[PDB]
Design a protein around this ligand. Structure first.
Ligand code: HEM
Ligand code: HEM
Ligand code: HEM
Lengths: 680, 311, 680
């Protein structure tokens, strides 16, 4: 039931105990050892040095990418016995449970960056199976920037801050990044996915997940199928708006990681369904692209998803550093029944992830760390190493040997349930430092993605590109982008060039098309549940407003929502102050009755909060597409900013009327009528 | 043109007009991996690939344990006089004497990616590259500290930094752990107020004063000493933001202070500071109602006025 | 009781198991993954890289000093309740048992150097007490080279190899070392101890041990006495001769570490008695020297040793690296009932040992290593760090807090059985970078040491100095050595100067004296037991010698001895070959009956061993002072080299007569009549 059961034996309780040195013995560590009253500190104060040394060495290197992230423990349950497609143990029986850990991230920011910056997001899952750890390391976007791993430094170097000043942090809005995008047209597909809602999710729990690469599933007989891994969220896909995200980056940098924490802590564990696409080996190049191209995805019209199981994250870490920070994912963490493919991007990753651990952990023994340990057991001839935690009984640490009697033994396909490469795999041709010509279509699929988005979502992507490319100080790079944008869509190149103040190139029908596919959109569908979503109830300490607000809260919470009651100060029912409140922290805003007092007159000007604060929360919340509401007499607040209850997403009237309306609106989540589209 | 980075010229590498190379020399192309066949697997004998990625994988070093978020610039320090009457230091030993410096401004509780405009104490660390060795004044923009003993530094910093369970919140003192410490260790109350003043949210690095905070000693060749406090007074003036402004700024531009320092210098408007001191006779250490070895206290200028030694 | 009981939890058994990766899953690791049969190895072979990576990173830095060493687990038993002198838990009750680990070492050689090199030896003990780990880190010599720790690099740099060529290894016989000894006259005392038998012990089990520094013992009331730590060997003090040690360094570099291993493995666990000298705090400068001077020792006539207990090493390590290599001793590993003194050498050590662990272990969490872990438990606010093995339940990792409710709590003298500095201690005077004038007598005590040695032992010290100072290529340095030697004794200066081809300086009687002290001599006493000692019985496969030799062995073994039967080849009773045999491996040599055939004629020239091999073993063994023997007709062997049975230490005759003779000779161990003394 508890995913962290293996981790119990290494948990330390300092409760009810006396202070100790790291080598034992009881101490006091609040005063240094001095020679005389106002004397100097002595070199023989071992207690000081032992205490400070550990503090001075607290820091380990941050991840080279995906530095900013958060994670939780969970359980994965299989829906069936999938031996028909894979020999993998964790999918080998129905209702079979495997402990998991998942870490969600952003790719370009450092340890202190905001969760709500526009970036690709990480979605890395570990399965602690009884045949060894198996890791699906993937993003919330099904495609990547590059087709060869050797270009990963080039991609990352450009998007990360400029080496002279380290500006800007966690942003692609600079010349260096957009220089790469234009000069390496392979990046265009993910670039579009980044500018959509995928670049700014509402939460970790509201995004899908992808392995991106094509892998292989192998059966005990050794028959293989091409596979793509999917994670479909049981909470629905949701995204923010860019103007909201920017303000949110300031008011709460920890927005995503806190939301994931609160959800689990409140009994509302998030869940994903594990789905796959199965492709016959002869159809690798069948569907208009090479399936070894990671800048492409396979539409569900060609091959639909089959769900194999569900994973739920029900436990939080006890120490962030020990668990979340120290964890080491690798694509090379693979098990029997799974195998790699000749994806030039994937091939390189296998080297990188293992090698980079030597930097972060300062040693080769990082899989001895509790959160990296498998549940299946480790037996081999590996010895020594920096920080070796084990003592090895076998003094014959070589193979083959007479003296160990053949142990540890060698396992393969036929004996010992050992890992095996797919037997049908082949290598044919010259040794080459080139890429296949099947990889040269960089514009068709970004158009396909754009075509399958709602008109407002299309506006969002364009509005995002207008914002980002506006920050480029080199006019020519912007010229270079428009040409690459043009090859995708003349409309987009036209539309973007307006903001940049440049001229749209003449149309190119070479890659243009009007094809459409499903599942790539966020806003066009409604959320399965409104549970955990947050409503901010603006109220006041004056009159009977609070009690009226309190009754609103209890009703709303029953439906699964989390309600925060905001007022001038922390009275009996008050969750938050107006000074400490902001629209970004709430999915919906509803003004309680009698709260009209703070939208005008002296009420809007108190020493207890910045002027215009309640008016701003309503203004921001409305202008950002959220459901807005007023209860009874509260309608004046809505017309204080010019919002009529007749509008969409706006509800005014009695409490029961407001509750039903708001809960309905949250299923819509975001109201796209409040955003201007080009040509209107 | 004195060019403080003149010594740094010897280690500058210009890659303009050159071909790609390995880190051990030899000309290469590093845009394609080595594969076995048209659509084959990557080869372990691709030395070019591994040498390139290994450096990328090991690009990261640990961030500073405190003051992780910061930025810096080179400069020159010019002395206003010959101060051998108070100190034998070479860099203050002659009038119009120039010493190369480097200064790094910071915030105490945030990590490498945090916002410049978060409420925190700020760092003001100066190095003097003198001809008698490096001399560093490592100080803040606030003249007082939270604690009176260094052995309590782990306790103070742990509290203000995020909670160990969820690592929330980033670069903020607005949580139970920090204010538990402030209430339980009343020594922190003084600096806490300085943090809640304008000092906690400066407009720029160029708009804050600087302090050595500690009392030190200046010694002459004969060995006579005076108690000293280091000050940096800004020639651009002291300016601060408002909290509601800073929060919004933390999102729209995290690099606000570091960009501002970059732009000013780049635009010919180099910022400047004056170095001032307070001199106290050794018998007057406990004169002013407190111990001068207490870093939770500062010495008012009505008790001891500032004397500038340079800029 | 098996001191490694705590270490059981981290023992790994790979018996009966299949090969695994470090992250789990069954594998075969004997073939690489190739592209096309005789193809290139693939980067996607995760099995290869994971295996090799651990191999490539197996190395950790060797210790900066005392790099070459060996160790064992044991138990320390207290003889009483010593609360009258100390508050230490491990000395707090009669018959009380504490687990220990001890590591013996040499100071100047690296990890691969010879055990039988002339050097000071280390004798470092850890006490795994229930009030935290306590370490007595000491040598086999009661005095040190320097009086200030800040001079430690200068000493070590000089004795270790030259920075230009890294020559010579593990030797003080070069110009730089003797340059230091002469230029820093403080080093002279330990220099004499090094040139005595202490520089070349027979075994780890045959040397005494010293804390060298004066410490303090404190009682619960806070009353203190100055203390010196002693370990007196229950196996007796024994040493080799230099000409023996040199040959031994080649034939067996592992002589000491193997001997300790074999003894414990054969049920003959070595044991030491822990003894102390108690000096009143007011008597610090009483005995002709400062007791904060580590270049001085306190004669047992001024303060005799009082034994507090006995420690026995009865367990061997399971993995050398995990246990012996990774263990980290510090003098700063101190507990309640012990305290430091203002010894300038000791003060610096406290910084050094803690700091240097950051280098060897690459992290601040090295006391989380199983062999460094205490048995008492660790509770504090130390968090994070590289390779953090624990998960901490307390999320309030600061000490002045309301939320943890005061835990972990602060302990002191009165509460929590906490550590406390001695309350009577004070600081008085100016802050100074100088040393006390009580430290300025560098010549009196080496004279005292020399005077207290048997005439042959005195010759050995001189013979060592003649050999060592002969290797100095700078004539002036040798002149400088004679000047310093002269200040100690004119006779020593005279005797040494002959070998150097120099002239003896004129006498300086300033520090000359004829005083004498006990316990500093090695040879003048006989061994308490001959158990574990090794006899090599030279025999042959021809005739009835072997059966005759076999019968001799069975007789010897009951007395505790270890017997090796040597012959031309590995016959029925043959333990070792002549090719594999040498005199250095044996405490006594005895020729079996009929073995005379190989000492002369065709027998001495066989392809099965180097020519003259049996004759050399007898020649070497006799010339090195060892008991030599022949049985019956075997007398032919002894007169081949000019040794009459009439001599002392030589026994010839019947087997029963020979056995009794050898066993008698082994108690004497070394026969000093066979070495020439100056003047004669
Ligand atoms: C489809 C392509 C890729 C995906 C889906 C992806 C995803 C991820 C994710 C989710 C993480 C987060 C690790 C964590 O949360 O602990 C990560 C880290 C990392 N990735 Fe990528 N990435 C991709 C491309 C690459 C490439 C091409 C390389 C190298 C050639 C690379 C090298 C690394 C490294 C070195 C880390 C740091 C992991 C650590 O420090 O333990 N990635 N990646
Ligand atoms: C008046 C009190 C203090 C002042 C003015 C101060 C100031 C600073 C500043 C400005 C930095 C940033 C250096 C840089 O930007 O490179 C820094 C870093 C640091 N400080 Fe403090 N601090 C104080 C208290 C303390 C105390 C009491 C300790 C330890 C007992 C401490 C330990 C450290 C450490 C370990 C660093 C990391 C430097 C590095 O990683 O290079 N600080 N301090
Ligand atoms: C009476 C004086 C000294 C004695 C008895 C002594 C003894 C020893 C011994 C026995 C070891 C071996 C540790 C082991 O076996 O694991 C050792 C190591 C060491 N000692 Fe000394 N030593 C002395 C002087 C010094 C001084 C003055 C310093 C520094 C100022 C020093 C620094 C070190 C260091 C850095 C190590 C390496 C330990 C490690 O890497 O874990 N020693 N010493």
């Amino acid at each position: 039931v508890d995913a962290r059961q293996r981790l119990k034996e290494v948990e330390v309780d300092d409760n009810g105990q006396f202070m100790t040195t790291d080598f034992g013995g009881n101490i006091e560590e609040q005063f240094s050892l001095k020679a005389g009253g106002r004397g100097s500190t002595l070199l023989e104060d071992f207690i000081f040095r032992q205490k400070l040394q550990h503090f001075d060495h607290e820091r380990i290197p941050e991840r080279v990418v995906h530095a900013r992230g958060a994670g939780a423990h969970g359980i994965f349950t299989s829906y069936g016995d999938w031996s028909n497609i894979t020999a993998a143990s964790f999918l080998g029986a129905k209702d079979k449970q495997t402990p998991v850990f998942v870490r969600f991230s952003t790719v370009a920011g450092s340890r202190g960056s905001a969760d709500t910056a526009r970036d690709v997001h990480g979605f890395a899952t570990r399965f602690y199976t009884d045949e060894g750890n198996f890791d699906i390391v993937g993003n919330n976007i099904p495609v990547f920037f590059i087709q060869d791993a050797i270009r990963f430094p080039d991609l990352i170097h450009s998007v990360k801050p400029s080496p002279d000043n380290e500006v800007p942090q966690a942003a692609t809005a600079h010349d260096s990044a957009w220089d790469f995008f234009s000069s390496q047209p392979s990046a265009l597909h993910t670039l579009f996915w980044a500018m959509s809602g995928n670049g700014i999710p509402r939460s970790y729990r509201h995004m899908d997940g992808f392995g991106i690469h094509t892998f292989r599933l192998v059966t005990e007989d050794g028959k293989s199928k091409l596979v793509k891994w999917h994670w479909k969220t049981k909470q629905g896909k949701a995204a923010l708006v860019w103007e909201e995200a920017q303000v949110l980056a300031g008011k709460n940098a920890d927005f995503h990681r806190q939301d994931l924490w609160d959800a689990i802590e409140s009994g509302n564990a998030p869940s994903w369904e594990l789905a796959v696409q199965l492709i016959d080996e002869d159809k690798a190049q069948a569907y208009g692209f090479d399936l070894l191209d990671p800048t492409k995805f396979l539409p569900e019209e060609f091959a639909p998803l089959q769900v194999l199981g569900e994973m739920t994250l029900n436990r939080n870490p006890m120490n962030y550093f020990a668990e979340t920070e120290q964890i080491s994912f690798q694509p090379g963490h693979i098990v029997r029944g799974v195998d790699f493919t000749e994806d030039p991007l994937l091939q390189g990753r296998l080297y990188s992830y293992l090698d980079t651990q030597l930097n972060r952990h300062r040693g080769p023994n990082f899989e001895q760390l509790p959160i990296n340990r498998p549940v299946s057991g480790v037996h081999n001839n590996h010895r020594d190493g920096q920080g070796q935690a084990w003592i090895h009984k076998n003094i014959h640490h070589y193979s083959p040997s007479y003296l160990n009697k053949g142990y540890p033994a060698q396992a393969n396909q036929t004996v010992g349930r050992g890992f095996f490469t797919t037997p049908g795999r082949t290598a044919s041709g010259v040794l080459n430092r080139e890429l296949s010509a099947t990889f040269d279509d960089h514009y068709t699929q970004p158009r396909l993605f754009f075509n399958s988005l709602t008109p407002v979502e299309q506006q969002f992507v364009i509005n995002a590109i207008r914002f980002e490319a506006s920050h480029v100080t080199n006019e020519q790079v912007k010229k270079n982008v428009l040409e690459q944008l043009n090859k995708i869509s003349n409309d987009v190149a036209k539309r973007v060039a307006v903001a940049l103040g440049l001229e749209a190139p003449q149309p190119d029908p070479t890659y243009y098309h009007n094809n459409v596919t499903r599942g790539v959109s966020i806003f066009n569908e409604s959320l399965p549940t409104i549970a955990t979503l947050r409503v901010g109830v603006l109220s006041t300490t004056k009159g009977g407003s609070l009690d009226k607000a309190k009754a609103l809260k209890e009703q709303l919470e029953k439906d699964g929502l989390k309600v925060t009651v905001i007022a001038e100060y922390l009275a009996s029912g008050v969750d938050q102050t107006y000074s400490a409140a902001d629209a970004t922290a709430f999915d919906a805003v509803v003004v309680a009755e009698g709260a009209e007092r703070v939208f005008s007159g002296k009420g809007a000007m108190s020493p207890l909060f910045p002027a215009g604060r309640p008016s701003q929360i309503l203004t921001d919340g409305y202008r950002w597409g959220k459901p807005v509401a007023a209860v009874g007499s509260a309608k004046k607040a809505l017309q204080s900013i010019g919002v009529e209850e007749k509008e969409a997403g706006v509800y005014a009237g009695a409490q029961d009327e407001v509750i039903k309306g708001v809960e309905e609106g949250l299923k819509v989540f975001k109201f796209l009528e409040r955003f201007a589209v080009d040509g209107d | 043109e004195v060019d403080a980075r003149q010594r740094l010229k010897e280690v500058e590498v210009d890659d303009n007009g050159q071909f790609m190379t390995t880190d051990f020399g030899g000309n290469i192309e590093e845009q394609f991996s080595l594969k076995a066949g048209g659509r084959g697997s990557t080869l372990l004998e691709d030395f070019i690939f591994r040498q390139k990625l290994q450096h990328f994988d090991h690009e990261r070093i640990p961030e500073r344990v405190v003051h992780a978020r910061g930025a810096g610039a080179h400069g020159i320090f010019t002395s206003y006089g010959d101060w051998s009457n108070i100190t034998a230091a070479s860099f203050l030993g002659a009038k119009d004497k120039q010493t190369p410096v480097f200064v790094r401004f910071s915030t105490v509780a945030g990590s490498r990616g945090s916002a410049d405009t978060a409420r925190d104490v700020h760092g003001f660390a100066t190095r003097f590259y003198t001809d008698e060795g490096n001399f560093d004044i490592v100080g803040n923009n606030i003249p007082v500290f939270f604690i009176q003993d260094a052995i309590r530094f782990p306790d103070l910093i742990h509290s203000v930094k995020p909670s160990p369970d969820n690592e929330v919140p980033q670069a903020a003192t607005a949580h139970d752990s920090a204010w538990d410490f402030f209430s339980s260790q009343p020594s922190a109350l003084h600096t806490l107020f300085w943090a809640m003043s304008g000092n906690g949210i400066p407009r720029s690095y160029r708009h804050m004063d600087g302090f050595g905070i500690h009392t030190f000693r200046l010694v002459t060749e004969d060995g006579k000493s005076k108690l000293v406090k280091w000050h940096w007074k800004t020639k651009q003036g002291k300016a601060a933001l408002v909290w509601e402004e800073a929060q919004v700024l933390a999102g729209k531009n995290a690099d606000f202070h570091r960009q501002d320092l970059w732009d000013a210098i780049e635009s010919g408007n180099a910022p400047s500071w004056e170095l001032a001191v307070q001199l106290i006779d050794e018998d007057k250490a406990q004169a002013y109602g407190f111990d001068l070895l207490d870093p939770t206290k500062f010495l008012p200028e009505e008790f001891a006025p500032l004397q500038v030694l340079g800029e």
